């Protein structure tokens, strides 16, 4: 299937407002989801709306959250999110991060107790359009073995980064700290496809090619992805006084209960270090020079990080967002779950 | 051979090579730290390279340090191409001081030599009760994912956080699969190398270390984005040479390296209870080490644990 950005937004906003979210909250949630789809990050796209709807109606996601922005220092704050939708809480936090970095050069803001926030690179792009460097990270559903391990501990804790170049240019990098996303496993379950042995592991911690055998995911680059997801958990969970590692709520544990997730934003105003105009020129030069690199045999081109997603996002404004078929059929009707 | 022994030795040699005693001790300290943890890539195998560079003026023996505070939580240490160990340590001290008072600190080290095992600097912060993050630019040596030309270096990243009592969690990683000192190592071994480490002039993975032109990024585009990020944060942000422009170790022992490093320090009290934080950090380390190992493994380590142990028993 294929529809435009604006229609898909409308549909998602409708389905979510119908579940019981306020109008503007559903708009924000929708905004973050279509962003993901437009960039080809479909696991954080419209596919999640049905799940979101059920949790909203059962009161797992708060539809009347009492936000409280606690400012703890000149460059630090916690947004107590009262288990609001994650897309909403995270963006609000980023907006406070932005104005703080604007005034005082740097900002570190935790988002305390929120639902799933979607593709977190949305929030760092926010910092970048304001002319700042953005870094963001959050906890996730426990699904990954430690390096050398056979029991679940951390989630697929994502990390994203963005910085501005000249004009509208933005360099956006995001990464999962696992080899692959859980959805790719359920999709090969939904195929009787057999998966690569580098993705995942059975209940004994032995890597497997049987998606039905899969109990947990492997961390990217062994101990490295392991350390990175540890760091993200410490920074967006332990730092905020939230449940951590093993303790983090799983997706389908209790649809009537808040996730209590944590997210951390870090924003840096380049003006507080050197010329922001030269910074932006150097970002734009980086992107050009990397894209001009002689590709290895096999490769058509070298991308600068996130470039392929930027290209997809741009091809999407012209041609429309690609979307797996039935999600569309769900979106129009009157049924939530 | 004791710890105060190599230190006093290296302190001596480097002070002979040109450095202030205060500077020689600090460089010694950091080289001493690294060997203990089995980070031989940065241990005292490097004293003579350093000594040469010091004597030849390619490291500033009389740096005009300038700490410019740019905001309540930001600063640049203008390092005048001083030894990186000295510069990085100094900026960390200011970053710790700043986080302690205002809760957060982002401090750039502008124009310094190689700083060594950068995990040393985040441990400083953790010892002070804070979270520490550090990262820096490196000698260009790595192809971009899909690339046949060099752009970024093995730009490392480090992170430490305090536990209960004297426990510290310390994690560091190179953004490449392997370091250059296993490639030159494999030529003196004369020994084939895994095809995961490096490529030839055409960017084709190679088993022949004499045919290595460039290293590969860890996890392809992921380590690639990470070394980019580190370059932007520790170089572009500071208005320093970046990417391909970054200087190499061996180009010119008379020339300042002009590297950058970035420190980020966070005071847990500005977010939650430090007591609970440290308790939970210690819990994490315990729980992870107690996880059932996968076959092939004798244990699960919390990140850095094996090095933490080495610098107990090497002492």
Q: To the nearest whole angstrom, how far is the Cα of B205 from the nearest Cα of chain A?
A: 10
Contacts of B71 in chain A (CB under 8 A): 75, 104-106, 272
Q: What domains can be seen in chain A, in order of their start residue?
A: 1-66+306-337 (1.10.1530.10), 67-305 (3.30.1370.60)
Q: How far is CA B8 from CA B25, B30, B32, B48, B200, in A?
A: 7, 13, 10, 15, 42
Q: Record the resolution, in angstroms.
A: 2.1
Q: Is B9 left (phi over 0), alpha (psi -120 to 50) or beta?
A: alpha
User: Which residue among the candidates A9, A44, A80, A116 is catalytic per the annotation?
Assistant: A116
Contact B294 A149 (CB under 8 A): yes
Q: Are A174 and A123 in contact (CB under 8 A)?
A: no
- Residue A47: count other Cβ atoms within 10 Å of its Cβ: 18
Which DSSP state fits A150? -
Q: Find out whether A117 and A29 touch, Cβ atoms under 8 Å.
A: no
CA distance A101 to A117: 22
Q: Which two tokens stand for residue A228?
A: 């990175």
Among residues B7, B23, B78, B114, which one is catalytic?
A: B114
Alpha carbons B50 and A101: distance in angstroms, whole number: 39
**For residue A107, what are the β-bridge partners?**
A267
Alpha carbon distance B23, A248 (integer Å): 46
Contact by Cβ (8 Å): A150, B294: yes
Closest to A82 measured CA to CA, from A96, A94, A64, A70:
A64
Nearest to A299 among B146, B243, B300 (CB): B146
How close A23 comes to chain B (CA, Å)? 31
* B214 burial via Cβ count (<10 Å: 0-12, 13-18, 19+): buried
User: Do A76 and B103 count as a contact with CB atoms less than 8 A apart?
Assistant: yes
Token code pair at residue B113: 């030599």
**B219 neighbors A313 (Cβ within 8 angstroms):** no
Chain A residue numbers with beta carbons less than 8 Å from the beta carbon of B242 are: 282, 286
The SS3 call for residue B138 is coil
- The experimental technique used to determine this model is X-ray
Mutation site for B-interface testing, chosen from A133, A207, A234 by largest number of B Cβ within 10 Å: A234
Provide the token pair at B59.
């490291």
| Rounded CA separation B25/A16 (Å) | 63
What b/e string do you get for B112-122 counting C-beta neighbours within 10 Å, with b at 16 or more? bbbbbbbbbbb
Q: In terms of DSSP H, where are the helices of chain B?
A: 3-17, 21-36, 47-55, 84-102, 119-127, 185-188, 221-234, 274-289, 305-313
Task: Please report, for chain A, how many H helices and E strands are present, in that order.
Answer: 10, 13
Among this protein's residues, is A116 annotated catalytic? yes
Q: Which of residues 149-178 of A touch B (CB under 8 A)?
A: 149-151, 153, 161, 163, 171, 173, 175
Residue with tokens 């105003």, as numbered in its chain: A269
| Structure letter (DSSP) for residue B296 | T
Half-sphere exposure of A190 (CA within 13 A, CB side): 6
Paired strand residues for A134: A162, A267
Find out whether A265 and A111 touch, Cβ atoms under 8 Å. yes
| Set of chain A residues whose Cβ sits within 8 Å of the Cβ of B151 | 289-290, 293
Question: Which of A171, A234, A294 lies closest to B149 in CB terms?
Answer: A294
A286/B225 Cβ within 8 A: no
Among the partner residues A105, A220, A225, nearest to B73 by beta-carbon distance: A105
What is the number of CB-based contacts under 8 A between chain A and chain B? 242
* Helix or strand run (H / E) with residue B160: strand B157-162
Instruction: Mention every residue, 6+ apart, whose C-beta is less than 8 A from residue B111.
Output: B78, B79, B80, B81, B240, B256, B257, B258, B259, B260
CA distance A252 to A256: 10
Alpha-carbon gap, residue B170 to A129, rounded angstroms: 34
Q: Structure tokens of A260? A: 């209590």
Both tokens assigned to B187: 């030529």
> Hey, what are A263's tokens?
């997210």
CB contact under 8 A, A151 and B291: yes
The single residue listed with the structure tokens 């170049």 is A165
CB contact under 8 A, B225 and A173: yes
Burial classification of residue A329, based on how many CB atoms lie within 10 Å of its CB (0-12 exposed, 13-18 middle, 19 or more buried):
exposed
Q: How far is CA A54 from CA A18, A28, A61, A269, B30, in A?
A: 11, 18, 9, 40, 55
CA distance B60 to B259: 13
Q: What share of chain A is helix, strand, coil (3-state, %, to 5)?
A: 40, 20, 40
- Please report residues of A whose CB lies closer than 8 A to that of B228: 171, 173, 286, 290, 304-305
Residues 6+ apart with CB under 8 A from B230: B135, B136, B137, B155, B156, B157, B175, B262
Q: DSSP code of B195?
A: T
């Amino acid at each position: 299937m294929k529809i435009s950005r604006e229609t898909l937004h409308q549909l998602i906003e409708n389905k979510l407002c119908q579940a019981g979210l306020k109008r503007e909250h559903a708009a924000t949630v929708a905004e973050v989801l279509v962003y993901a789809d437009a960039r080809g990050i479909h696991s954080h796209g419209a596919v999640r709306v049905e799940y979101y709807a059920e949790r909203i109606s059962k009161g797992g996601t708060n539809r009347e959250p009492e936000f409280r922005l606690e400012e703890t220092g000149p460059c630090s704050a916690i947004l107590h999110a009262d288990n609001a939708a994650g897309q909403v809480a995270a963006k609000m936090g980023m907006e406070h991060a932005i104005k703080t970095a604007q005034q005082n050069g740097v900002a570190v803001v935790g988002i305390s107790r929120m639902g799933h926030s979607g593709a977190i690179s949305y929030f760092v792009q926010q910092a970048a359009r304001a002319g700042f460097i953005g870094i963001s990270m959050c906890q996730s559903d426990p699904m990954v073995v430690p390096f050398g391990g056979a029991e679940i501990y951390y989630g697929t804790n994502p990390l994203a980064f963005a910085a501005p170049g000249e004009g509208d240019e933005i360099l956006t990098f995001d990464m999962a700290t696992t080899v692959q996303a859980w959805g790719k496993v359920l999709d090969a379950r939904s195929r009787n496809m057999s998966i690569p042995d580098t993705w995942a592991v059975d209940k004994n911690g032995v890597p497997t090619t049987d998606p039905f055998a899969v109990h947990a995911l492997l961390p990217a680059a062994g101990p490295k992805g392991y350390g990175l997801m540890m760091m993200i958990d410490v920074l967006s969970g332990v730092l905020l006084g939230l449940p951590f590692g093993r303790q983090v709520s799983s997706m389908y544990d209790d649809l009537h209960a808040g996730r209590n997730l944590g997210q951390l934003h870090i924003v840096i105003n380049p003006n507080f270090f050197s010329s922001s105009e030269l910074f932006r020129q150097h970002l734009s030069q980086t992107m050009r020079e990397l894209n001009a690199i002689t590709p290895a045999p096999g490769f058509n081109q070298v991308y600068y990080p996130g470039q392929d997603q930027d290209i997809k996002q741009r091809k999407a404004a012209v041609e429309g967002i690609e979307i797996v078929d039935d999600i569309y059929q769900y979106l129009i009707s009157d049924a939530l779950y």
